[PDB]
């Protein structure tokens, strides 16, 4: 699947349940791994708009070349079948 290779941070606390598990269904379903916490492995972090990152977290994000991304990377590129530019979904940038 299009998301072969990829892991995800899922920061996506204030979504409603429902949306938290379909997200996770499109990324298993897509060869995705995913993972409620931040580490080196992360290739990917989903961050809903309200939830935040901290000073921390944004240096391990930089060290590690992690993506951040919001959750309409993952509903786009499911939708269009093809994984899309990760630069075009990142709340930070």
């Given at each position: 699947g299009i998301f072969a290779?990829?892991?995800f941070c899922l920061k996506?606390?204030?979504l409603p349940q429902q949306q938290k598990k379909?997200?996770?269904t499109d990324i298993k379903e897509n060869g995705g791994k995913f993972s409620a916490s931040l580490n080196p492995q992360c290739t990917h972090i989903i961050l809903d708009n309200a939830?935040?990152?901290s000073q921390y977290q944004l240096n391990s994000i930089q060290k590690?070349?992690?993506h951040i991304a919001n959750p309409?990377?993952?509903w786009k590129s499911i939708?269009?079948?093809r994984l899309l530019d990760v630069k075009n979904y990142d709340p930070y940038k």
């Open positions: 290779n990829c892991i996506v606390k204030y379909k997200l996770q939830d935040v990152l590690n070349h992690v309409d990377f993952i939708r269009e079948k």
